[PDB]
Design a protein around this ligand. Structure first.
Ligand SMILES: [Zn+2]
Ligand SMILES: [Zn+2]
Lengths: 136, 5, 137, 4
């Protein structure tokens, strides 16, 4: 029994988020493997095999059966500190756990800063196009 | 897998 | 920083609950000492020095200046596992901490069971008496 | 101290 904010640190919570995940028995990227690797399932109508690292917030889609979630995570987000954690959840100390949650909080904020940047640039493109068109 | 579109 | 239900496990939270605690510098049972020992301040109109262990839920009033909170806790609630904890909060492992929070949950329940029982018995005495009186008349 |  942990608060909602912290559940994603629990493997079994992460596994539970996989609802209608297509890759099951026989595949390398099963819910169990995705979850061990830190991923949560975050599907859209648009992008339905979308998954996200709960810790560094990197999102990945286009999953294929033979994809090893751990190697995919290393490839696309080499610096994610969850990948460094070798001890089991319950073997962590509260100090270690609190250190991790702080790094996660920083990761969230960095990601939101990076999204707001991308949104601002997209709006700036449209504005630029609109002005060019009215100049022409 | 690959990054988001 | 941490969820409300857990804060009592933190010494600084416990100390912070002591608001107009009478026993300050020069006394053995200061807020700092009461908090080191596990106690929270839960004053009433009726008993304004009331303190309770956050873990085992034992309540004690009638505090005196030279009272050592730790020795009073050992006396009145010898089985309280918080008294066994040697490490600081941040040195516990999550497994240890979860095991402690379970024992606390079970202590809360035992306390509420024990109260319900006592209230039920008081009501049963009254009802029994009323019916005796009626059969007597 | 003492028990309530
Ligand atoms: Zn990650
Ligand atoms: Zn106690």
């Amino acid at each position: 029994t942990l608060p909602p904010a912290w559940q994603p640190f629990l493997k079994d919570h992460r596994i539970s988020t996989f609802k209608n995940w297509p890759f099951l028995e026989g595949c390398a990227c099963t819910p169990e493997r995705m979850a061990e690797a830190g991923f949560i399932h975050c599907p859209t109508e648009n992008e339905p095999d979308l998954a996200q690292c709960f810790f560094c917030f990197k999102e990945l889609e286009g999953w294929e059966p033979d994809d090893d979630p751990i190697e995919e995570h290393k490839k696309h987000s080499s610096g994610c500190a969850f990948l460094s954690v070798k001890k089991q959840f319950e073997e962590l100390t509260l100090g270690e756990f609190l250190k991790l949650d702080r790094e996660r909080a920083k990761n969230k904020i960095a990601k939101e800063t990076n999204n707001k940047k991308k949104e601002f640039e997209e709006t700036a493109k449209k504005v630029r196009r609109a002005i060019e068109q009215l100049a022409a | 897998a690959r990054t988001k579109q």
